[PDB]
Amino acid sequence: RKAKVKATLGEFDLRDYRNVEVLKRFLSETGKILPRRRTGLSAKEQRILAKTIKRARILGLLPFTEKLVRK
């Protein structure tokens, strides 16, 4: 019980790889793409979001990796 990323959003194009502050919502503390448990996405949804994120990363908009703070 935290909350799911989808609930916290309005309408958004899942195909829009340019739009960041929405996308980064789907990455973890690290830059890893969040599990369905957390994203609240459906199969097809999640699956589209993946490619979207990835394209975004190649474009230098979103990270491949992040450092882990505290610990």
């Binding site: 899942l14 474009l59 990270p63």
Partner: protein, 101 residues
């Protein structure tokens, strides 16, 4: 003809003259590869997630175009010859797939 989106990420340190020149070359290439430009969004410089070419950021161009398929790769090829071009991503245009709308 099919409908794509050309993303261009080039050198943020570029002064006005040089930037005008790169946009010039890009336009010309796009023309010689048989593409028509339906619309353009120039976002300009933005803060990158990770550094590209030792640079903390990059200047962003976005073009929606209609062009012949058998051409597209060469287009991208040509687009990347420029020393000042850090990334080029061409993508077949799709309709929006949304959720919670």
């Amino acid at each position: 003809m099919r409908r794509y989106e050309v993303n261009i990420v080039l050198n943020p340190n570029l002064d006005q003259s040089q930037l005008a020149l790169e946009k010039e070359i890009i336009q010309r290439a796009l023309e010689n590869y048989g593409a028509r430009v339906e619309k353009v969004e120039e976002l300009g410089l933005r803060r990158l997630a990770y550094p590209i070419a030792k640079d903390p950021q990059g200047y962003f161009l976005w073009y929606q175009v209609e062009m012949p398929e058998d051409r597209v790769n060469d287009l991208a090829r040509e687009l990347r010859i420029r020393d000042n071009v850090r990334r080029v991503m061409v993508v077949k245009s799709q309709e929006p797939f949304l959720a919670n709308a």
